[PDB]
Amino acid sequence: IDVLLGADDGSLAFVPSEFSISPGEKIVFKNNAGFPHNIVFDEDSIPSGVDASKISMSEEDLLNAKGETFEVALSNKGEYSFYCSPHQGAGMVGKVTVN
Ligand SMILES: [Cu+]
After folding, report:
1. Residue of 12, 35, 37, 83 marked active site
2. Which of 22, 37, 43, 94 sits at a 20 to 30 Å CA gap from 77?
3. CA dist 85 to 7, 25, 53, 65, 94, Å?
4. Is 63 a catalytic residue?
5. How many CB atoms lie within 10 A of CB 95?
6. Distance CA 40, CA 62 (A)
7. How far apart are CA 83 and CA 93, in angstroms?
């Protein structure tokens, strides 16, 4: 599943921001507009026992250039909240459900 980092109108959003997948299916987060961006899973809002570091950028890391990507596949079932660290307060957040 491709997820744009920044909408095509420049909005600071993941597109889509709420979605479901299956265990092992690629999420490709792609820099689109308003970058730099990153993708950080909230370590307090992911499934029990999941290591956020295996699936997240650090907050200090950035995708700098248009078209740069961060790929992740999620294993464990449940809800995972994530955000772009520099744009979290602007509303650049999302939630993926592995089911
Ligand atoms: Cu961002």
Report:
1. 37
2. 37
3. 17, 24, 14, 16, 12
4. no
5. 16
6. 10
7. 4
Q: Can you tell me whether residue 24 is helix, strand or coil?
A: coil
* CATH architecture under which domain 1-99 falls: Sandwich (2.60)
- Experimentally, the structure was elucidated by X-ray
37 is catalytic: yes
Instruction: Name the resolution in angstroms.
Output: 1.1
- DSSP annotation string for 29-83: EEE-SS--B--EE-TTSS-TT--GGGT---TT--B-STT-EEEE---S-EEEEEE
Dihedrals phi, psi of 53, to nearest 5 degrees: -70, -20
Annotated catalytic, 84? yes
Q: Calculate how far, in angstroms, residue 23's C-alpha sits from the geometric centre of ligand 1.
A: 25
